[PDB]
Curated annotation (Swiss-Prot), chain A:
It comes from the Eukaryota. It comes from Oryctolagus cuniculus. The calcium release channel activity resides in the C-terminal region while the remaining part of the protein constitutes the 'foot' structure spanning the junctional gap between the sarcoplasmic reticulum (SR) and the T-tubule. Pore opening is mediated via the cytoplasmic calcium-binding domains that mediate a small rotation of the channel-forming transmembrane regions that then leads to channel opening. Cytosolic calcium-activated calcium channel that mediates the release of Ca(2+) from the sarcoplasmic reticulum into the cytosol and thereby plays a key role in triggering muscle contraction following depolarization of T-tubules. Repeated very high-level exercise increases the open probability of the channel and leads to Ca(2+) leaking into the cytoplasm. Can also mediate the release of Ca(2+) from intracellular stores in neurons, and may thereby promote prolonged Ca(2+) signaling in the brain. Required for normal embryonic development of muscle fibers and skeletal muscle. Binding of [3H]ryanodine indicates that the heterozygous channel is activated by Ca(2+) concentrations 4-fold lower than normal. Single-cell analysis of cotransfected cells shows a significantly increased resting cytoplasmic Ca(2+) level and a significantly reduced luminal Ca(2+) level. The gene is RYR1. The N-terminus is blocked. Detected in skeletal muscle (at protein level). Fast- or slow-twitch skeletal muscle. The modification Phosphoserine is found at S20. It is found in: Sarcoplasmic reticulum membrane. Homotetramer. Can also form heterotetramers with RYR2. Identified in a complex composed of RYR1, PDE4D, PKA, FKBP1A and protein phosphatase 1 (PP1). Repeated very high-level exercise decreases interaction with PDE4D and protein phosphatase 1 (PP1). Interacts with CALM; CALM with bound calcium inhibits the RYR1 channel activity. Interacts with S100A1. Interacts with FKBP1A; this stabilizes the closed conformation of the channel. Interacts with CACNA1S; interaction with CACNA1S is important for activation of the RYR1 channel. Interacts with CACNB1. This is Ryanodine receptor 1. Belongs to the ryanodine receptor (TC 1.A.3.1) family. RYR1 subfamily.
Length: 49, 221, 49, 48, 48, 49
């Protein structure tokens, strides 16, 4: 639930008026890959469904 | 006088693993011809078994800032944390790269790490980052320093995978500390240096040390 | 399911625009490759099915 | 740190034929700051 | 004071004071506590 | 009124500025002052060992 909340916030930040903001989007991707727990227990990588 | 890694120097990448409660040092290695993919050659035993360093050795062709790398792609220096480095295999004249292909079923996101024929592209480039807090970006890299290597192309770390019983090298979002250990920096002309293939001549070049030709009876012993 | 749907939506929105793709911007290509690696197509088609 | 920033910004403008006005202003601010820093270091060491 | 880099060595054993390294789930917690051990080799960072 | 012989044994005479001397309380800092050697706080399970 909290993950969903933060995810839709980031959605509103990155995507505006039908177009993506690359400046924020690239950063979001880098941060998420640095912390892959945000992706979920799935998509974990090792031992991940 | 603290030794600083510099371009055109030759280095080996070492990683440390704990197996059977016993530390083991492993060097990154690639044959090149025949097998592009990299593997790990242990060096701890050494005295009881000599390792094959020739393939392990790499040379630092370039160290660059990210912006300079971007401009170059669009078109003796000390290493600095945060810069991007290009590494050439000493034997195969190939470049270390993050391959698209993946062999590891354990980690689906992970990519294999292997040699690449041409320096063109982001894949061959890697960025160094301090393993420890005290080190900071823009600081000269020091021999013995633990390093974190991140691919420009994949934004993944050079990683040691112990999930399988066999130890494996991969590009993953998990990070592995690596030590860049020098083999040579600069050689004076002549002046034999270790690790080089050469011939041994008994006298004034007439005859040389050698073993029996192929399919000889002595078994080339 | 909502968490994963929101994560997928955020990633797709972060995805680069077609005209950047066409121009060939390396950062856009890198972002798209990263997103593709994170989310395979077969899983999306299975969820849609 | 300032030198690293200036080097990166120069790399950004390296391919471009002509720097635009905002880039000129930013260079000018950076060089004024670096001028003050150089003068401060000089004044520390002077005397000597 | 505040300048010298000192390594603490246990005289009889000769071991070097160093951090143990994180135990599993310690990195999950993010705790700032790193247990100190006496080890044969240690790390660069051991200096105090 | 009975007398006892006493020996006055020096510990320190004059110290140069800085220049750590024995018998002084101090703190041990692992690196650039971020963290220091210490033991567990009071009423900890480890018994402050």
């Amino acid at each position: 639930c909290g993950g969903e909340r933060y995810l839709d916030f980031l959605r509103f930040a990155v995507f505006v008026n039908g177009e993506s903001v690359e400046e924020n989007a690239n950063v979001v991707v880098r941060l998420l890959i640095r912390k892959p727990e945000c992706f979920g227990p799935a998509l974990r990588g090792e031992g991940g469904s | 006088e603290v030794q600083f890694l510099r371009t055109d120097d030759e280095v080996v990448l070492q990683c440390s693993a704990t197996v059977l409660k016993e530390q083991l040092k492993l060097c990154l290695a690639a044959e090149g011809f025949g097998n592009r993919l990299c593997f790990l050659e242990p060096t701890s035993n050494a005295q009881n078994v000599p390792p094959d360093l020739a393939i392990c050795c790499f040379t630092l062709e370039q160290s660059l800032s990210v912006r300079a790398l971007q401009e170059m792609l669009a078109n003796h220096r000390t290493l600095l944390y945060g810069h991007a480095i290009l590494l050439r295999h000493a034997h195969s004249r190939m470049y270390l790269s993050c391959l698209t292909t993946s062999r590891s079923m354990t980690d689906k996101l992970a990519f294999d790490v292997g040699l690449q024929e041409d320096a063109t592209g982001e894949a061959c480039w890697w960025t160094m980052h301090p393993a420890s807090k005290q080190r900071s970006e823009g600081e000269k890299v020091r021999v013995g320093d633990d390093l974190i290597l991140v691919s420009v192309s994949s934004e993944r770390y050079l990683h040691l995978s112990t999930a399988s019983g066999e130890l494996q090298v991969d590009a993953s979002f998990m990070q592995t500390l690596w030590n860049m250990n020098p083999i040579c920096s600069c050689c004076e002309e002549g002046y034999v240096t270790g690790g080089h293939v050469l011939r041994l001549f008994h006298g004034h070049m007439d005859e040389c040390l050698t073993i029996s030709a192929a399919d000889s009876d002595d078994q080339r012993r | 399911m909502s968490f994963y749907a929101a994560l997928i939506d955020l990633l797709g929105r972060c995805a680069p625009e077609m005209h950047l793709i066409q121009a060939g911007k390396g950062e856009a290509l890198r972002i798209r490759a990263i997103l593709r690696s994170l989310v395979p197509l077969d899983d999306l088609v299975g969820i849609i099915s | 740190r300032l030198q690293e920033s200036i080097s990166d910004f120069y790399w950004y403008y390296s391919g471009k034929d002509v720097i635009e006005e905002q880039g000129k202003r930013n260079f000018s601010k950076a060089m004024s700051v670096a001028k003050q820093v150089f003068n401060s270091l000089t004044e520390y060491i002077q005397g000597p | 004071y505040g300048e010298s880099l000192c390594f603490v060595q246990h005289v009889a054993s000769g071991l070097w004071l160093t951090y143990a390294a994180p135990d599993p789930k310690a990195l999950r917690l993010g705790v700032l506590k790193k247990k100190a051990i006496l080890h044969q080799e240690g790390h660069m960072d051991d200096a105090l």
